[PDB]
Structure 1
Amino acid sequence: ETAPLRVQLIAKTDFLAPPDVPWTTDADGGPALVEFAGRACYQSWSKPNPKTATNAGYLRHIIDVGHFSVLEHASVSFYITGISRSCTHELIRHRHFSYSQLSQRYVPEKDSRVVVPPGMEDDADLRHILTEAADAARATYSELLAKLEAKFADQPNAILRRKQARQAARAVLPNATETRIVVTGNYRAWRHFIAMRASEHADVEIRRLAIECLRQLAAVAPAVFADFEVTTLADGTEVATS
């Protein structure tokens, strides 16, 4: 069974303006918070600059002048499914995110799905080769699992027994095995992720993820992600540059 990439926005900043600060703005949530924090530095509550009088104008300005630390106050979480283990091994090299990921030590993978590398998505021959090799690996897994539980059948704690079995058995599961992950980042962390991974230099699977994250973040905070331009390459893949 193959798994399609799915990205679902599950959390974002709720902003509660403090009543005794003489300031308002034409926005809500993370974008509003980011403006509040910017202004706290200068106590510029009355907005004496006409061209930064709207939220979008203030956020646009912040980025233009490169005051990126102000962006860190607002965050967004996604639940990402239909991503491979090779892709999460790349993703989690980003150290200014927080992660909760599906565990092969704890979750049975006998019926696990696989993710097709975008490079061979339209190639039926290559896909068939991939999927049959995946079925062979899953069969080896179930075979290893039985023998391993038998082998640890002097381990009185049955729960620990199965986990000892499962963590060794998963040695044969391929990189393409689907995983699922909650990723939380602040806006600065997201911008850095998109710059790095939505590039022609990046692997195509993570590039595809970065583009989809960008599209969804652009909706929550248009002015924070505006400078990114999405273009298509010769192969129909997209990159985002700023």
Structure 2
Amino acid sequence: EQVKLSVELIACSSFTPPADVEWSTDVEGAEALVEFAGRACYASNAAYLRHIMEVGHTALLEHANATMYIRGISRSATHELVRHRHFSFSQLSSEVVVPTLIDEDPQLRELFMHAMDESRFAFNELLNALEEKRKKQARQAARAVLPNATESRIVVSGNFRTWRHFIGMRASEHADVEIREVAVECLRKLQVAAPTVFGDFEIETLADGSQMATSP
């Protein structure tokens, strides 16, 4: 069965100022935390976070964290995701993800889904023969025939700087296609959660229908 990408923001930083500190702000949560961390080194929130980014003191963004639950991401794009070492992961220990270039062609999709069945048939058949004559090891041996398109479900956490770095690298290049879509959907959720920290990124749709994000 074919599944599509679904990214859900499941965690963000909840902020509470210290009682004795004389300080108030217009925003609530992670952006108030980044503002507190900035002022703690020595007008409004959005004006202040614009200045942090302008001077490029991104070490302050490391206090705010966000967690994503990502579904409908292939094993290969999950491998590209875990290459980013400053994230923490929890991965799922049948569903299949089809590349956009194949999905937009019904002829190619029919052939892709046929190959997905072939792999599943080969997996089931090998697993049976392995369990005929320890069974945890029979499953992980049989999994060797499973394609890169196999859907994985992953919980991913990192600070705002780690996110800004992931988006800035993946949502810009072309190359690769799936990891872009993941990065654009992550940014979109982060722009709802933290408008100013992630407002410099501009989401645009390309000629071929896929989206990308760039920053000056």
Q: Please say whether Structure 1 and Structure 2 have the same fold, judged by a TM-score greater than 0.5.
A: yes
* TM superposition shift of 1:68: 0.2
Counterpart-to-counterpart distance in 2, 1:23 and 1:12: 22
Equivalent positions of 1:63-82 (< 5 A) are 63-82=53-72
Aligned residue for 2:24, secondary structure, equals coil
Matched, 1:197 2:170: yes
Contact 2:174 2:180 (8 Å CA) reproduced = no
1:58 is aligned to 2:37:
no
Paired with 2:155 and 2:141, the residues of 1 have a C-alpha distance of 25
| Corresponding residue SS for 1:224 | coil
User: What is the rounded CA distance, in whole Å, between the counterparts of 2:182 and 2:175 in structure 1?
Assistant: 11
Q: Contact conserved, 1:149 with 1:162, CA < 8 A, in 2? A: yes
Tell me the equivalent position of 1:11.
Answer: 11
1:45-124 equivalences under 5 Å are 53-103=43-93, 112-124=94-106
Does residue 224 of structure 1 match 2:206? Answer: no
How far apart are the structure 2 equivalents of 1:178 and 1:118?
15
Residue aligned with 1:14, SS: coil
> Mind listing any 5+ residue stretches in structure 2 that lack a counterpart?
none
Contact 1:119 1:204 in 2 (8 A): no
Matched position secondary structure for 2:10? strand
Does the 8 Å CA contact 2:62/2:161 hold for their aligned counterparts? yes
User: TM-score under structure 2 normalisation?
Assistant: 0.97
1:223 alignment partner, SS class: coil
**Corresponding residue for residue 50 of structure 1:** none
**Could you say which residue in structure 1 is the equivalent of 2:39?**
39
Larger radius of gyration: 1
Residues 71-97 of structure 1: per-residue CA shift (max 9 Å, x gap) = 010011011000000110111100111
SS at 1:170 equivalent:
helix
The alignment yields a C-alpha RMSD, in angstroms, of 0.9
Say if 2:9 and 2:67, in contact at 8 Å, map to a contact too: yes
Distance 1:188 1:67 in 2: 10
Partner of 2:132: 150
The reply on whether 1:240 has 2:199 as its aligned counterpart is no
**In the alignment, which residue of structure 1 is the partner of 2:117?**
135
Give the structure 2 partner of residue 108 of structure 1: none
Q: Is contact 1:27-1:55 (8 Å) kept?
A: yes
Between the two proteins, the alignment pairs up a number of residues equal to 215
Aligned-residue identity in percent: 65
Look up the SS of the partner of 2:13 in the other structure. strand
In 1, Cα distance between equivalents of 2:11 and 2:175: 27
Q: Which amino acid aligns with 2:60?
A: V
Counterpart in 1 of 2:158? 185
Q: What residue in structure 2 maps to residue 169 of structure 1?
A: 142
Paired residue secondary structure (2:41):
helix
SS in structure 2 of the partner of residue 41 of structure 1: coil
Structure 1: give runs of 5+ residues left out of the alignment: 43-52, 104-111, 152-160
Secondary structure class of the residue paired with 1:17: coil
Rounded to whole Å, the distance in 2 between the matches of 1:149 and 1:58 is 62
Q: Is the 8 A contact 1:196 1:202 kept in 2?
A: no
Whether the 8 Å contact between 1:33 and 1:73 is mirrored in structure 2 is yes
What is the distance in 2 between the residues matched to 1:173 and 1:142? 10
Aligned residue for 2:139, secondary structure, equals helix
Once residues 120 and 86 of structure 2 are traced to their aligned partners in structure 1, the CA distance between those partners, rounded to angstroms, is: 34
TM-score (norm. length: structure 1): 0.87
